[PDB]
Amino acid sequence: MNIFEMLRIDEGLRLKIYKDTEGYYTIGIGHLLTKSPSLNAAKSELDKAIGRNCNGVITKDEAEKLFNQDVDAAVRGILRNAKLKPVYDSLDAVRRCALINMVFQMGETGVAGFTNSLRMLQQKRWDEAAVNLAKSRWYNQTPNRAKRVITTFRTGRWDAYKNL
């Protein structure tokens, strides 16, 4: 298992513009297009993103291309972030995937806000950090996914994703 396979389990693949758990316009493998309520604003962002007139629909190929860019940007954002970098560097390869997953879902900013859990992950207090991460809007709004990510940080293994 790797970051791509992991995210693809969590996000799914949809070739037609769709709405987020949050109600936001998205396409592909969890590629948010706009937080704006117009399908029209979304379509426009889509065409801008792909470089063609898509009419709200993309190919598998275009979905994977957007996915590769998004993953690359998530990693690079972690590496550029003063709060995230040190945690990332401290972690093993599997746990690094769990932090990447959070950044992809919620953005650098959002994750950098989990001050206390970050501190615990740096200290390698796995059980404590898993309890602290669960105390969040994130866990309450998308519990099955948060639970997979959390198990990943707790164990350092891919068990949560075996089932799936």
Please, which experimental method was used? Answer: X-ray
Q: Are 74 and 98 in contact (CB under 8 A)?
A: no
**Maximum CA extent, the chain:** 50
CB 11 within 8 A of CB 30: yes
- Tokens describing residue 28: 């592909």
β partners of residue 31:
27
In sequence order, the β-bridge partners of residue 32 are: 26
For residue 16, which phi and psi values (nearest 5 degrees)? -120, 145
Spatial separation of the C-alpha atoms in residues 14 and 58, rounded to whole Å: 9
Specify whether 22 is catalytic: no
Sheet holding 25-28, edge to edge: 14-19, 25-28, 31-34
Residue 4 assigned as binding residue:
no
How far apart are alpha carbons 81 and 129 in whole angstroms? 20
Token readout for 110 is 């959002």
Helices (H), the chain: 3-11, 39-50, 60-80, 85-90, 93-112, 115-122, 126-133, 137-141, 143-155, 160-163
Supply 150's token pair.
Answer: 């959390």
Name the nearest CA neighbour of 25 among 102, 17, 157: 17
Q: Tokens for 105, please give them.
A: 């879902």
d(CA 114, CA 53) in angstroms, rounded, equals: 39
CA distances 25 to 11, 66, 69, 79, 105, Å, are 14, 15, 18, 28, 14
Angle at 68 between CA 117 and CA 14, to 5 degrees: 90
Given the residues 10, 11, 62, 70, select the one marked as catalytic: 11
Phi-psi bin for 107: left (phi > 0), alpha (psi -120 to 50), beta? left
**Does the active-site annotation cover 11?**
yes
CA distance 152 to 159: 7
Of 87, 73, 159, nearest to 119 by C-alpha is: 87
Rounded CA-CA distance 85/58 in Å is: 34
Residue 40 known to bind ligand? no
Give the closest residue to 78 by CA, choosing from 24, 136, 121: 121
Query: Residue 103 has which token pair?
Result: 């950044």
Out of 5, 10, 20, 45, which one is annotated catalytic? 20
- Beta partners for residue 16, in sequence order: 57
CATH class, range 1-164: mainly alpha
